[PDB]
Nucleic acid binder design. Sequence first.
RNA 1: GCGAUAACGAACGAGACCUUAACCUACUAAAUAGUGCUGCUAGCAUUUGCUGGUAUAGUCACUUCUUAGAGGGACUAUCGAUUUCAAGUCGAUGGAAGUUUGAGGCAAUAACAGGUCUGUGAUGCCCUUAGACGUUCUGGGCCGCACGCGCGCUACACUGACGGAGCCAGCGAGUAUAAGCCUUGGCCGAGAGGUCUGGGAAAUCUUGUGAAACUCCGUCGUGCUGGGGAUAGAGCAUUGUAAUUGUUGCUCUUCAACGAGGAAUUCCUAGUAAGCGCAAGUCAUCAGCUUGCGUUGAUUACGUCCCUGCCCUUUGUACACACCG
Lengths: 141, 142, 199, 100, 141, 72, 68, 84, 62
Amino acid sequence: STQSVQTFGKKKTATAVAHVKAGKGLIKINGSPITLVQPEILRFKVYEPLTLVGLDKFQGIDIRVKVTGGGHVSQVYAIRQAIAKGLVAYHQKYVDEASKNELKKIFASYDKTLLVADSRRMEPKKFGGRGARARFQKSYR
Amino acid sequence: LVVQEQGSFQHILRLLNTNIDGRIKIMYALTKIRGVGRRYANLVCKKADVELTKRAGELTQEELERIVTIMQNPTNYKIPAWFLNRQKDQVDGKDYHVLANNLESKLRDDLERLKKIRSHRGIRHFWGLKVRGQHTKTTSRG
Amino acid sequence: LQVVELATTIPLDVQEAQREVKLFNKWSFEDVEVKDVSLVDYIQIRNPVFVSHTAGKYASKRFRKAQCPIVERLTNSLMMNGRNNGKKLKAVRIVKHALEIIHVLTEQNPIQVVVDAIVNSGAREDSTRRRQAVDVSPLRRVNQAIALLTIGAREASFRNIKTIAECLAEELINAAKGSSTSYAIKKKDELERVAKSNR
Amino acid sequence: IHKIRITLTSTKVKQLENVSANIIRNAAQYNIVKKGPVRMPTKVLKITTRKTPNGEGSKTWDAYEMRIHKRVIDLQAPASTVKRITQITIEPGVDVEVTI
Amino acid sequence: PGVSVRDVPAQDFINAYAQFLQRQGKLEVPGYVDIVKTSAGNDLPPQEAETWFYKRAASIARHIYLRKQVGVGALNKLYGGAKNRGFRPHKHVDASGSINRKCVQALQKIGVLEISPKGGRRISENGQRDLDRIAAQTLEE
Amino acid sequence: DKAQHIVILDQEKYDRILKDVPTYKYVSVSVLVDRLKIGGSLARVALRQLEEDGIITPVLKHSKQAIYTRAQ
Amino acid sequence: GRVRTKTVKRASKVLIERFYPKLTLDFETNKRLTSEIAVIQSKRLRNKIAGYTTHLMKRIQKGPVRGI
Amino acid sequence: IAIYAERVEERGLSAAVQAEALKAKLLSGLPIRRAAYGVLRFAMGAGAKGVEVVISGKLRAARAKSQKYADGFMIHSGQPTRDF
Amino acid sequence: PVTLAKVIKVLGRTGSRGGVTQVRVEFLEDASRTIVRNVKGPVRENDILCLMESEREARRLR
RNA sequence: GCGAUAACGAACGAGACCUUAACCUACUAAAUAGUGCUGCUAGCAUUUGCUGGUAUAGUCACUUCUUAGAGGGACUAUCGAUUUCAAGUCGAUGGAAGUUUGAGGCAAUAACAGGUCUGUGAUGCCCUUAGACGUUCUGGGCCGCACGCGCGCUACACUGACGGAGCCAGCGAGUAUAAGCCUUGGCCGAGAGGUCUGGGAAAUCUUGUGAAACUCCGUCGUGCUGGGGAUAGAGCAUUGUAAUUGUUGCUCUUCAACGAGGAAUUCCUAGUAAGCGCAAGUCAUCAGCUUGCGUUGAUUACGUCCCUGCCCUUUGUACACACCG
C-alpha cells in the first residue's frame, strides 16, 4: 500500500464509489474506460471534472469508480461527483492544502453538484390519487 | 448500393387473385390477399428465394407463380403445421391454409354449422351479438 | 499545447476542450451577445456549458429560472404533449442536430441564431382582461418567445416527413431574421397588433 | 469450544438491545471471544386497509405497521456455559434460538 | 497495452464477433431460424434473416464473458422486452428459450462456453482467448 | 393517397439527382424527398451512395438525422 | 412564518430571570447551558429555547426589556 | 403454560376496570348520571390527571343521545395520547 | 419608434386576478421623466422595459 | 405572538409530539454487506501492467460505500436592511439542509335523522321458524341489451412503428406427507408450457428481481401506411370437480371505429405534473383496479379576490325547517 483514498457520489438512488490511488493516470468505469461511457450525450458530464482542472492533475493518480443503482442519467451524475470529490480528497490527504482549495473553488465555481450531492428525493405517494400531489379525477352529478 | 434499372419496373396494380399494388414492398403487398398476414407473407417470400428488399412491381412471373404455389401448398415447402391456418380441417382433418374466396366459403360453413345445430354461439351470430362472452350493456352501442 | 498522456487513451477532441467550454464541443458561447439591452439579464449565455442538460434546481425561487442556460430552456420546452414528457435525452439530441442544421444553412454561430430568434420572437405589448393594453416584462418576453418557437416547430413536424430538428432549425432561422414565415413572428405580430387597438 | 450462534428478534428495540448487551457482557466477563452484534436490516410489515367498515364516504386508508428487528452474535466456547448464559438472560418481549 | 472486451464499445464488438463467427463457419445454426420469432412478446421475425443468429450468439458470448455463471432463463429475461397487449397496458415478457439454449449449446460445442459448477454456463479459456483477440483487432484500427 | 412520390430510381430521375444536388447547401432525406418527389427509402440510399462515390459530404451521422453539406 | 410560541418564550424569560449572570450572547454556550439547567423533552425545543434566550440576552445589552 | 393472577395496582387508574364497573352499575338499574360521577370521583381519587366518561344510546327516550361526564385534564392530539 | 425605461419602484399588483403590476418606469436617456405603467409578466427593479408609446399613464384596472 | 385591556388566572384545539426523507471518512460492529491484500490461477501485453475466476478456514486486516444503536447537527446562525423597534419580514453568506427543511400519523367543541342491522356469536322491536325467510345439493343468475351517465386503459403516429444491439431501479413476498410457496440451473417445445434437479421459512435462494420508458444501428416514408388492433374463424396449452355464456396464456388468419375530440369540465407549484414500468392486496385461475415503489423529468406562478368557497369584525333582517328561508 502506498497512497489511496475512497470517496462516493450520489444522484437519487445511484451511488458511485471511487478508489483514487497512485498510478499512471488510469480512469475506469466498472472495469471499462470512461471514453465509452453510455449515453454519449452525457459523456461530457463525466469529462467535465477532467477538462475543467487539467489532465495533469490526473498524471499521478489511478482512479477506479464503481457505480451502482439508480438509472443511466443518475449514474452519470453520480460518477462525475465521485471523481471530483475523489480528486479533492486525494489532494486533502497527500498534496498541499492550497491546491486542494484551488480545485474545490474551481469545481464550485462551475457546478455545485460536483462536490455536494443533490438532496432531492421522490416524495411519497398519497392515497386518493396516482401521485404525490396528483389526485383522482373528481366528478359531479 | 443504388441501381439504375428500367423495363422490369411494372407498377401494375394487378397481382395474384386481387389487385395488389406494385408500389408496395413485397413483404406487405401480399397482405392485401385476404388470408395472408405480414408474417405469413414474410415466410412465403423467404421460402420462394425472393429478396425482401425488392418491391412487388419489380418482380416477374416466375416469382409470382412460385409464391402462388408456396401459398397454396404450405407443407410442400416446409411450413410447420402450427404456422398455417384452419388446422385439422373440420371436414377431412387435414391442415388447410385457407385463402381468399375459400376464406368466405369456410366462414359461411362454420357459421352455418353453428346455426344448424342450434348452438348458443350460432344463435348469437344469428342475432348479431358478440359471441365471446363480452359484456354488451355499455359498449355494444355501435 | 495541453497534450499530456494517460494510461487510458483520452480522445484528442476532448483534450482540445481544456482551453474553452463549448456546446457539444463544437459551438462557442463567448462570441454571442444579446442585441436587446432589456433582454440581457434574462438570456444567460455568460457561463459556458458543454451540453444542455444540467439537472439544475430552477423552480426553487422566482427569478432563479433566468440563470438557466438558454439552450437548456429551449431543450426543456421541446418536451411536450404528454408522450414526450420526461424524454430529455431526445430533446437535447434534437437541439444538437438543429444547431448543426442551422450552421449548415446559415454560416453563423448557432447560439447566436438561437439568441436572435428568442429576442425577436417576444411581444413587447400585450392585452389583459374588454381587454386592456399592457406591457410585457423581459422575462415573460423571453419565455413567451421560447414557447412560441418550440410550439411552431412541433406543429410543423407533426404529420410531416420533415424531421423535428429540421423544423426547429427552420423556425429558429426565420425568427432570427425577423420574417413573417416563422410561427413566432406571426404570433408576435398578432399580439402587438391586438394590443395596439386596446390602448 | 463450539461455534454457537444466537439469533435475537423482537418488535420492541429497548429489550432486544438489553438482551444483546447482556449476552455481550456475560460472554466478556466469562472470558469468551465474541463476534458481534450484527444488526439485520429491519423488516416493516405493512397492512393497508380501508377505514370504513361499509363502503361509504371519502376513500381513506390506514397504514398499520409492525417492525421486526434481528441481531446475531457468534460465540466460541463450550456448549453448557453459553447455554446457561442464554438461559439466565431471557425476557418476555424478546424470543431466542440457540443454534450450532 | 493488454486489450480486453471492456475496452471496446459493445455495438461494434458484437458486430465484429458476429462477422467473425459467420466467416468462420462451424457454428451450428438451427434449421428453424427462418420461421421463428425471438420473443412471444414480439410480433415479427428478425429482419436480418441470414445473420440474426450470429449476432445473438456473439452478444450472448460477450454477456457470458463479462459475468460469472449466467444461464438460459437469465438470457430469456435479458432479451425480452415490452409486449403490445392491445388495449391492456404494456408488460415485460421473456424471450424464446429454445433460441437462447441452442445458441449457448452451439457456443459450447465450438468450445467457447463450458458448464460451470454452481450451475449455468461460463466462458471458456479458449472462449476468453477468442473474445479477447477479436477485441484486440477491433481496437487496433 | 396523395403526394404521388417516386418509387424507383429512373434514368431521367437519376440525371436529375446527379445534376441538382451540388446546388444544395444542406441535403438530407427530407431535402431529397421535397426537392425530388422521390420516396424516403430511395433518398437514404442516394445519400449513402453519394457518400461512397463522393458527391455529398457529411457533417454529422445519426440513425434519425443525417446532416450532409456540399462536397466542395 | 417563524413566530415563537408561548412555551419557548416563557421558558426563555424564566431562564433569564433565574440564570442571567451565567448566560451569554452565543448560541452554542447557551445551548449547553439550557441542556444542563432545563429538563427539555426534545432537542428541537431545546434549540428553540436556547436561540430565543440568545435573542433576548442580545436585546438586553442595548437596554432593558419588558416582562423580564 | 402457567396462569397466575395479580390484583390491579390502582382500581381507579384502570380504564378497563372502571368501564366494567360502569357496565355493572348500569346493568343493576342504577341511574346513569350517578354511575358516571361515581367513576369520575373514584378515578380522581386514585390520582389520575383527568378522566372522561361518555355514554351513548337511547336514554329514557326513543332518540339516542350521547352524555359526556368530564373531570380534570385531558389531551386529545399527538403522541402523548398513546402514552398517558 | 420605441423607447426604453427602467423600473425604479414596484407600486403593487393590480387587476381583478392580480395578473398586472404597477411600476414606475424611468427613461434611460431622458432621466428626468418617470411614468407609471402596467406590466403583464414578473418584474423587478432595474428591469429595463420597452414602451411602444411612452406618452400614456395608467392608474388602475380590474 | 407583540401588545391593548373590566378582568384575572386557566382547559382543549394549533404548536410542541411521533414516524419517515436528507447530512455525518465522528462512536459500536459485521463469515447473512462491501472492500484492500494475499494464496491458487485465467486471457491480453511482458515494466512490477490491464481486465477477470476462485478460496465463509486465508486460522489476514479493515468499515468509504451497505446495515442499525447510540449520538451530533438548524436555532433563522452571521451580515445588511426595514417595522410599535416589540412581534416579525425581506435579501444575501456559510451550510447536507434556511417554504414550520421535504412528506405524513395524530387531531377540540357542537353537529348530520350522512353510511353501515349485508363485518361482527354488536344489538331492541317486528317478521319467519319443518312444503322454512334456518341449512345444504344440482342447475341457472349477479355478465343478460334500442339507450343515458361516472372512474379508466389503448390510440389517432416520424418527438413514430417494427428488427437487432446496449443495458440501468426501488418498495416488497415466499413452504413440507403437501391438498401444497418463491423458484435458480439442466433438458424438450416456435411459443405458451412440460420435465428433472438443486437453493430458500429467507441481508444467505429466487434476485444485481439484467423492469419499462430510454440509448445506438437499420427497415419503413406521410397513407388509415409497417399508425390502431376492436370483432371474428381455426388450432395448441394451463388452472379447476366443472371453462358452453370464448377463465387465462400462446400461434396463424380476420384488420372495424379513430385523422387530436362541441357545449362543458378535472387535477396539479419541484424530483412536482406528465410519461414509464415493478411489488403487494384481491388470488386455484384472471388486474385495463387500488396501495406503495422507484426510472426519465418539465412548461408556468411564487400572485389575486374576478369566479367557487372558507375565517374574523361591523351592519340589516318580517329568516330559526335558518335564503333550497
